[PDB]
Amino acid sequence: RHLELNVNCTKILQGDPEEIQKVKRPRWTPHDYINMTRDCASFIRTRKYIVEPLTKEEVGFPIAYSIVVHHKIEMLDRLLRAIYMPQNFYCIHVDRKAEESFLAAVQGIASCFDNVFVASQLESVVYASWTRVKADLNCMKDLYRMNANWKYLINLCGMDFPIKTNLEIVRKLKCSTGENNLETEKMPPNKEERWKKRYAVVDGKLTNTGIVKAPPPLKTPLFSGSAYFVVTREYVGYVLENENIQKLMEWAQDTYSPDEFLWATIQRIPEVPGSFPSSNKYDLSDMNAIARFVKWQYFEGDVSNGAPYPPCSGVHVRSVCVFGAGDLSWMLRQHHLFANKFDMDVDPFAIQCLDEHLRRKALE
Amino acid sequence: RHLELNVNCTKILQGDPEEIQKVKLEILTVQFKKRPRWTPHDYINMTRDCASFIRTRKYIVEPLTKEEVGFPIAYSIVVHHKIEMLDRLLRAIYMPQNFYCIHVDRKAEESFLAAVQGIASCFDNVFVASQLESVVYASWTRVKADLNCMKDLYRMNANWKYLINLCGMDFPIKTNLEIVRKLKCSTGENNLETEKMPPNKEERWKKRYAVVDGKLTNTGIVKAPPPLKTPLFSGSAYFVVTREYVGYVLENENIQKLMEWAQDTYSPDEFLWATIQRIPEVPGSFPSSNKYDLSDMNAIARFVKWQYFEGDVSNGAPYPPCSGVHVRSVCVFGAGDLSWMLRQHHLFANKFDMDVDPFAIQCLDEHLRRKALE
Numbered sequence: 236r237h238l239e240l241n242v243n244c245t246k247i248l249q250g251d252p253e254e255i256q257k258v259k260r261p262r263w264t265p266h267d268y269i270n271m272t273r274d275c276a277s278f279i280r281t282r283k284y285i286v287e288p289l290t291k292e293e294v295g296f297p298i299a300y301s302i303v304v305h306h307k308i309e310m311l312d313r314l315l316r317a318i319y320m321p322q323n324f325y326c327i328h329v330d331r332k333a334e335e336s337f338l339a340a341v342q343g344i345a346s347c348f349d350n351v352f353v354a355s356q357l358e359s360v361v362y363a364s365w366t367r368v369k370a371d372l373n374c375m376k377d378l379y380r381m382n383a384n385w386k387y388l389i390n391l392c393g394m395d396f397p398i399k400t401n402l403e404i405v406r407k408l409k410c411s412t413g414e415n416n417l418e419t420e421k422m423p424p425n426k427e428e429r430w431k432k433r434y435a436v437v438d439g440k441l442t443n444t445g446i447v448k449a450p451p452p453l454k455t456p457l458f459s460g461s462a463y464f465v466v467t468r469e470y471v472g473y474v475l476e477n478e479n480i481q482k483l484m485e486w487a488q489d490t491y492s493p494d495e496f497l498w499a500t501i502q503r504i505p506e507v508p509g510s511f512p513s514s515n516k517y518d519l520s521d522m523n524a525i526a527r528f529v530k531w532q533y534f535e536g537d538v539s540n541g542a543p544y545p546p547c548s549g550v551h552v553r554s555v556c557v558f559g560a561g562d563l564s565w566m567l568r569q570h571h572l573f574a575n576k577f578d579m580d581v582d583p584f585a586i587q588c589l590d591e592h593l594r595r596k597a598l599e
Numbered sequence: 600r601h602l603e604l605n606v607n608c609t610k611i612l613q614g615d616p617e618e619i620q621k622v623k624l625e626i627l628t629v630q631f632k633k634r635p636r637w638t639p640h641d642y643i644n645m646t647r648d649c650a651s652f653i654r655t656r657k658y659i660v661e662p663l664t665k666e667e668v669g670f671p672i673a674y675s676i677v678v679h680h681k682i683e684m685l686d687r688l689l690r691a692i693y694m695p696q697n698f699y700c701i702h703v704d705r706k707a708e709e710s711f712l713a714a715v716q717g718i719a720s721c722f723d724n725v726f727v728a729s730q731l732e733s734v735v736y737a738s739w740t741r742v743k744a745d746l747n748c749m750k751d752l753y754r755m756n757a758n759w760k761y762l763i764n765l766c767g768m769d770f771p772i773k774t775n776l777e778i779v780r781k782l783k784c785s786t787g788e789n790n791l792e793t794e795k796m797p798p799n800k801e802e803r804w805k806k807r808y809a810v811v812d813g814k815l816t817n818t819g820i821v822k823a824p825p826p827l828k829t830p831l832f833s834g835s836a837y838f839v840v841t842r843e844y845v846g847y848v849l850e851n852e853n854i855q856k857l858m859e860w861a862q863d864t865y866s867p868d869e870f871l872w873a874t875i876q877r878i879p880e881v882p883g884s885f886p887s888s889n890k891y892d893l894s895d896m897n898a899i900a901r902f903v904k905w906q907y908f909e910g911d912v913s914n915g916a917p918y919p920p921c922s923g924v925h926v927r928s929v930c931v932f933g934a935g936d937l938s939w940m941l942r943q944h945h946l947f948a949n950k951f952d953m954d955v956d957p958f959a960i961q962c963l964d965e966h967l968r969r970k971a972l973e
């Protein structure tokens with residue numbers, strides 16, 4: 236139990252109403268990590284990172300990660316540790332607007348592992364802009380050329396957390412049998428202004444300029460989706476090299492939230508590795524895809540009455556549920572690989588319980 | 600191996616335009632269409648000596664892997680004719696650890712039934728259902744045929760994991776091991792088409808139907824609303840369900856109420872399973888929210904090509920044109936349909952017919968056998 240990580244978690248994980256209510260300040264700073272990481276051997280030991288593969292099955296199925304962050308070093312460290320394995324690869328994209336101490340702290344952690352690094356290209360990410368997509372593309376470039384054996388790439392943000400162990404992830408990926416898995420649905424006509432008009436970053440905010448854009452440079456229709464995906468290395472190589480895709484991406488640079496349509500659209504282009512035909516019969520909702528479990532305030536409700544999922548037990552930020560300990564029990568029963576979003580400032584117990592649970596389960 | 604099975608199937612499976620064209624011209628040959636075919640009486644005799652039947656037909660009577668042994672599958676096969684296709688189908692999916700219930704329509708020729716009973720007598724885990732229905736197209740009796748097999752299979756063994764129902768025109772496109780793996784990947788959930796009920800399919804349960812002149816017809820009588828809190832969903836007669844789902848369907852009172860209500864609807868097989876799959880508390884079900892809907896293409900139960908959807912895949916069509924022939928808008932596969940088909944994730948495909956293209960079945964059959972023996 237030396238690798239295991241005053242509330243009873245088991246009761247929380249079982250959805251015990253008693254503890255849920257019962258549950259519903261010291262903290263390391265970037266400088267603590269900068270110092271703490273000087274001695275990698277001790278950092279790794281004290282933080283309890285797993286530096287040896289757990290099974291031969293996992294050794295044979297390497298996974299790559301693109302992690303886009305900009306703050307909260309303790310959360311990054313906790314997320315990294317939860318998903319870290321020696322055989323995998325981890326690219327960390329630190330926003331150019333991040334505090335220098337944060338960047339130094341991230342490099343501090345990354346510098347302790349030969350498979351963790353900071354992307355060779357970094358963007359100043361603006362909410363809803365192409366730069367958010369570019370951040371992942373920067374990591375895709377690095378990850379693709381550095382190793383030819385990883386099977387899938389999963390992109391993450393700082394407030395994500397896994398709800399599956401590395402082994403469980405590997406198994407679900409094998410279950411996809413070479414196909415990609417991400418939300419991709421017929422584009423609602425009502426969102427057309429997101430790409431029919433040109434957007435410009437005005438005073439820090441991406442805004443509609445009213446300038447008319449040309450039609451998308453592709454035969455295939457645009458599809459609606461998420462910024463999060465689970466794609467094969469082959470999909471990545473195609474995105475990075477295919478000329479038509481490059482044309483599509485350059486056209487998308489001045490659209491609104493291109494991250495919410497680019498991946499979903501490419502996933503339906505013929506000849507793209509791991510893609511699905513454009514016929515709507517193949518559409519995948521956020522719940523049917525396994526990329527990310529996210530609760531939207533306007534959809535929460537009585538599951539036995541038509542609701543996709545139960546109400547949030549934490550708090551809502553921009554209509555998105557920031558999980559509370561009470562959300563954990565139902566959440567763990569879903570098939571998604573990761574869930575969003577978590578925040579130590581909202582409910583640190585939702586994190587701790589999940590983290591401890593996955594570590595114990597993995598050590599089995 | 601004694602178990603392996605002038606056309607080069609390897610090229611067909613690769614979509615070789617040349618090899619495909621060759622099989623199509625072969626089919627047209629008078630010599631081919633005038634080839635000797637087996638009769639139900641041939642099978643009645645051949646099955647007299649089971650040891651000989653098994654060896655001659657090359658049935659696998661020993662598990663291939665420990666993985667498969669630890670994951671038994673049950674099958675409900677609804678048939679009424681074409682004994683050779685039933686033979687090819689059964690052989691292609693047969694494994695000693697699995698269970699197979701065959702429902703022969705009560706209106707099937709007496710010789711067909713005898714033949715089926717003959718084939719079944721050769722395998723302890725293969726049997727004819729204890730209750731046989733006279734199935735009328737689109738009627739509740741089609742559903743009853745499967746319910747009859749569910750009862751027999753559920754009581755016969757408590758260790759099988761999933762039940763997969765089939766008809767005589769189906770054929771697998773996955774080996775038993777591949778099937779076992781996709782079922783394990785389902786993590787105790789069922790898998791079948793289930794989507795929001797289309798407005799153009801409501802007249803089927805809003806009115807009572809009765810068989811008139813051999814066909815189910817609207818009586819004009821309006822029936823009460825379904826005995827359910829959740830909505831009715833649209834789907835297919837074919838499913839992939841856990842043993843737990845089967846036990847719940849056979850036992851639960853409310854489900855019982857739903858079924859009795861559906862008895863006089865049109866094509867209840869196309870909404871019953873899809874609907875039960877969305878009822879809270881049903882083992883392996885999905886929430887009723889439409890975010891969980893599964894189309895025929897996203898579900899893994901059955902790959903079927905509908906004439907009105909076929910087209911340029913690279914332009915919006917869910918699949919390429921039928922290389923075989925269409926019957927009631929459904930594509931009866933030709934050898935040319937195999938290449939693309941094998942790349943799909945479904946467990947089985949429909950429809951196949953050795954009177955349309957025997958090579959479609961043969962190439963698929965050899966490929967799966969070879970793949971399994973590897």
Ligand SMILES: *[C@@H]1O[C@H](CO)[C@@H](O)[C@H](O)[C@H]1NC(C)=O
Pocket residue numbers: 607608609610
């Ligand atoms: C069928 O053709 C393939 C190459 O297209 C070849 O590998 C295979 O051996 C051929 N089969 C026979 C029996 O000639």
Ligand SMILES: *[C@@H]1O[C@H](CO)[C@@H](O)[C@H](O)[C@H]1NC(C)=O
Pocket residue numbers: 640641644
């Ligand atoms: C075997 O089947 C043939 C028809 O194929 C039938 O005429 C014959 O009687 C059977 N053999 C016997 C005599 O048992």
